[model samples]
Target: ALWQFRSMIKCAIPGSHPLMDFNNYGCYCGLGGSGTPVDELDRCCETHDNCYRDAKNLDSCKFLVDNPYTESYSYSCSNTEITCNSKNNACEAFICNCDRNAAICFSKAPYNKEHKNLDTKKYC
Candidate 1:
C-alpha cells in the first residue's frame, strides 16, 4: 500500500523525471533522501502540508495528497537464521536469529512502506 502511494507521487512529479526521483522536480522528497526540503523523518502528509504552507505549488500538493508516503524495510546479516510460519494468509512467527561472534546483522526500518504495526521480527 505504501509502495503504491509513493509510486503515485513519484509518477505525478513533472518533467519526465523517474518515478523514484522526487528531488529534481519541484516536489518534496521529505526524508526519502538528502535533497528534500523537509527533514528526512518527515512523512508525506507533513511534507504536503509544509509545501502548501510554503506556497510551493499546486503540483506538489497534488502529488503529496495523491501518492502520500510509507515506510519499507530492508536488512543484511551474516550467519543469520530466519524462520517463517506456514498455513496462514499473512506472514507470521517470523524470526531472524544471528548467533555468530564474527557476524553482524543490521535491519533498516524506513518510513515509506505501509505495514501493520506488529511487534515481531523482520522478514522479506
Candidate 2:
C-alpha cells in the first residue's frame, strides 16, 4: 500500500526532484539524517528517505555558510524558499510524493507507539 503511494508520486514528476538530492534517510526521515528506526512508523520514514535517495535527482545549490556573532548570524543556510512552497518549479511532486507515502504509512502502521505494551521495547 505504501509503495502504491510512492509509485504515484514518482510518476507525477517527469524529471528528478531537487529535494531528492537532499535526502537523509532515518526513522524520521527529513532533510537531514533520520533517527534510529524502532517501529513500523519509523520504518515508513526510512522508506520515504529511500524514495528520495533512489528516485534520481541532480540539484546542486549550496546555502552552507556561517557567521560568528553574539546571536550566530544566519549568513546563509535558510533556503526556506527552495525547500518550501515558494516556487512551483521542479521537485514539487517529488517532495509531495515522499510525504504523502509516509503519511499513509503512519496511518496504516501496525507498530504504533500508542500500543507500546504489545512490544516489550516501550516506545511512545
Candidate 3:
C-alpha cells in the first residue's frame, strides 16, 4: 500500500491533474544524467495531494495506480518526497515543480530538513 503511494507520485498519477505533472515530462534528473524523465524513479505522482489521495484509499487503487511493489525485498531505497501544503491553514495542493532548480530532494525528516541543496559546497 505504501509502495502504491510512492509509485503514483514518482510516475505522476495520470488523468487531467491541475497541480502536478501527470506525465513523465516532469521528472528532473540531478547533476549528470540523460534519458526520458519517464524512464526514471520507482514511482511518480503529479502532486503531493495525489499521493495522499491514493494512500487514504489504498485497496481500490492497486493495479489501476500502477504502483511498484518491493519484489526483491533487498537494498531498494524508497527516496521519494511526498509534499504537503506549505501555506498557513487550508490543505492546499503543491504546485507542479519540474524545473531542475525547483525539484524537491528526499527529506531528512525528524531533522525537519527539506529542499534540494542548490549549492555544492564541500563540508569543511
Candidate 4:
C-alpha cells in the first residue's frame, strides 16, 4: 500500500482518489477510477506497484520501505481484520460481499447512507 504511493500524491479525502499523469503515471487532476470524478470513485491508487530495474535484493529494495507486510485472507463479515493483499481491491471485494441492506451495499448498517436499487433484487 505505502510502496505504491511512494511517487503518487494522496487525495484530500481519505481513500478519495489519485492524481497521476497518464503518460508517466504522474500526478493529475481527476480521481483514479473508471467513471467520472465522483465520490463513488471506481479507481484507487493503492492498486499499482512500483517498477523495479536491476534490483540487487528484494528485502532491501528502494520503495519497499516502511510497508505493512502481512498475509491475506477473505472475511465473511466486517471488521474481522483479515489480511488484505491490496487495500483498494480488498475494500471493493468486501463491498461485493456486503449484505444488501435497504437497497445499497453498505459498508456498515444504520449509519452509512443507502442508494436506490434499480435492479429490484437487492433492494426489495
Candidate 5:
C-alpha cells in the first residue's frame, strides 16, 4: 500500500478564498467545480512570459493573489520551495506536478479558498 499524508494552514485572509496566479494561464475562482472556466476571470494581466490575474469573491471566502510554485510529490502537501536571484520584483517559480496530485491540479492557479483551493481540489 502507498503511504498518505496531508496538512493545512490557516487562511491569510479570513473568509477570503485562496487564489494563485502563476504563468501564462489566468486566474481560477468560485466554489469547487463551480464551472468557472479558464477563459473567464475578473481580470488578467498578461506579459511576454509571466502573467498576473485576479477573480471575483464568492460568498464569505476569497484569497489575494500570492505566488505559488509547483514542486515534486510529497506529503503534508504544502507548496514547494522556490529560489530567486537578483531580479526586480523577481520570484522563483515551479510547475505543479499535476500527475502526482490529480485531485489538486490546475492548468493555472487554483482559486476559491474554501472550496477551490489546491488543498481542497486538484486538476490534472
Candidate 6:
C-alpha cells in the first residue's frame, strides 16, 4: 500500500526486520496468527486505516486492495489501483505524512531476534 512505501523504499538503520501482517487489515507490517503489533504497529495501522477512510472523503487519492485469503493466500493483494489525480494533488502528501509518522515509530521499535518465527524468520 502507499502507506508502506516509506518503509519499503528505505530499510531501517542499525538493521531491523521487515514488516509482515494479516491477510489484509488495511495497512502493512506484522507477524503471527492474528499477529502482534510488534511495536505498537497495530495502533499505527488502525490510525492509518482511519486516515485512508477520511482520505477517501477528500478523494485526493483513491485505491483498492484485494487480498483473497485461503483460496489463494499466495496471490494476496492480487488487485489494486492507484486511482490518484492525474495532476498535482495532496494525495501524496497525506499518504506520505501517515507513513512518515509510522516509520518514525517503526525505527524506534527494539529489534530482538527472539521475535522471529515461521512468519518472521525470513527477515532474519
**Count of clashing residue pairs in every prediction:** 8, 0, 13, 5, 14, 1
Which pairs clash in the backbone of model 2? none
24-123, model 3: which lDDT tens digit per residue? 2234222222232322231222222234333233453333343222111111123433433233211112112221112232221121112122122220
Evaluate residue 22 in candidate 4 and report its C-alpha lDDT on the 0 to 100 scale. Answer: 22
Local error of candidate 4 at 8, Å?
A: 28
How well is each residue in 5-50 modelled by candidate 5, as lDDT tens digits?
0111112122221333322123333222222244323122111112
Q: List where candidate 4 sits over 4 angstroms from the true fold.
A: 1-34, 37-79, 85-112, 119-124
For candidate 4, the clash count comes to 5
Point out where model 2 deviates above 4 Å.
Answer: 1-36, 53-90, 114-124
Residue pairs that clash (backbone atoms under 3 angstroms), model 4? 19-28, 20-26, 20-28, 21-26, 33-43
Q: What is the lDDT of residue 16 in candidate 6?
A: 40
Question: What TM-score goes with each of the models?
Answer: 0.20, 0.36, 0.17, 0.18, 0.17, 0.43
Per-residue C-alpha lDDT of model 6 across residues 6-88, encoded as one tens digit per residue: 33413432344335432132223432233234435445544545553454444654544322110010011112211212233
Candidate 3: regions farther than 4 A off = 1-38, 46-52, 55-85, 88-124
Q: Estimate candidate 2's alpha-carbon lDDT, on a 0 to 1 scale.
A: 0.36
Pick by TM-score: 1 or 5, better one: 1
Which portions of model 1 miss their true places by more than 4 Å? 14-20, 23-28, 34-124
Report the C-alpha displacement of residue 43, candidate 4, in angstroms. 6.2
TM-score of model 1 relative to the true fold? 0.20
- Please estimate how well model 3 matches the true structure, expressed as its whole-model Cα lDDT: 0.26
Give the alpha carbon lDDT tens digit for every residue of 14-121 in model 1: 223322233211223322232233223223323333432331123223222322222121232233322222232211111111111101111111233232221112
